[PDB]
Write a protein that binds this ligand. Structure first.
Ligand SMILES: O=C(O)[C@@H]1CCCC[C@@H]1Nc1ncnc2[nH]c3cc(F)ccc3c12
Length: 167
């Protein structure tokens, strides 16, 4: 038993809700919140900009030190950093950005990072400003992640299309 509430169950291990991930994180304080990161951990907009704003820019300060030490992530890769006031940990995961011409096959590799964590609160990778089809992203999520994933979908209209079209 865990503290996630109001989710619809899609599969044995995948759950979905219409929610603002920032507010969902603030209330649940999950062990892991996933950020829709880029390779530079520049949290300017989308999910990343919202999460970072909710940390009063502490996520960005920590991220800049991480990059200065380690260099950029790989597309499809991830790193574990602090969850600040939102979660114990933040798993920064880089899905391919279709608006940068990145290979969508890397979306499966991106979701594989979730399997290193028993339970996660997450957005749909490569959705939103990353330019991928959120229905495809949901399919890859279901077919790749084996751990327990609670997906927060900000847009109510999108949440309903994702549910109604789910196979
Ligand atoms: O659902 C959507 O509209 C999109 C799905 C994936 C790409 C961007 C959006 N992502 C999110 N997903 C969950 N919570 C969120 N809070 C947010 C707050 C913001 F200021 C911007 C985006 C989100 C967001």
């Amino acid at each position: 038993v865990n503290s996630f509430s109001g989710y619809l169950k899609l599969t044995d291990n995948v759950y979905i809700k219409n929610a603002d991930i920032v507010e969902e994180a603030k209330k649940v304080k999950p062990t892991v919140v996933v950020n829709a990161a880029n390779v530079y951990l520049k949290h300017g907009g989308g999910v990343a900009g919202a999460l970072n704003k909710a940390t009063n820019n502490a996520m960005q300060v920590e991220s800049d030190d991480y990059i200065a030490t380690n260099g950029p992530l790989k597309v499809g890769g991830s790193c574990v950093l602090s969850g600040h006031n939102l979660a114990k940990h933040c798993l920064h995961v880089v899905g391919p950005n279709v608006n940068k011409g990145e290979d969508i096959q890397l979306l499966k590799s991106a979701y594989e990072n979730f399997n290193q964590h028993e339970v996660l609160l997450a957005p749909l990778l490569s959705a939103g400003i990353f330019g991928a089809d959120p229905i495809h992203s949901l399919r890859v999520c279901v077919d790749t992640v084996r751990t327990n994933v609670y997906l927060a979908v900000f847009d109510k209209n999108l949440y309903d299309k994702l549910v109604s079209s789910f196979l």
